Amino acid sequence: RVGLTEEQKQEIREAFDLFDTDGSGTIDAKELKVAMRALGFEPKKEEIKKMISEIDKDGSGTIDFEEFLTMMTAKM
């Protein structure tokens, strides 16, 4: 079923915090690339850029918790 129960939201928050290794408050594009490598992805510049742009409503090169949460809500 599509949905984020509190437990999933907690997991997403923990993951977010971890991926924000810098502790910037936002995951930098590079940290997101590292995260995607941790997720076992194969980055491709154009796809990465476009996906990042879609998620990056406001975070301007970084991804805020809410933006990351939105991504996670969409992708699961």
Binding residues are 20, 22, 24, 26, 31, 56, 58, 60, 62, 67
Q: What is the DSSP string of 4-69?
A: --HHHHHHHHHHHHHH-TT-SSEEEHHHHHHHHHHTT----HHHHHHHHHHH-SSSTTEEEHHHHH
Binding-site residues from annotation for Ca(2+): 20, 22, 24, 26, 31, 56, 58, 60, 62, 67
Cα-to-chain-centroid distance, residue 34: 10
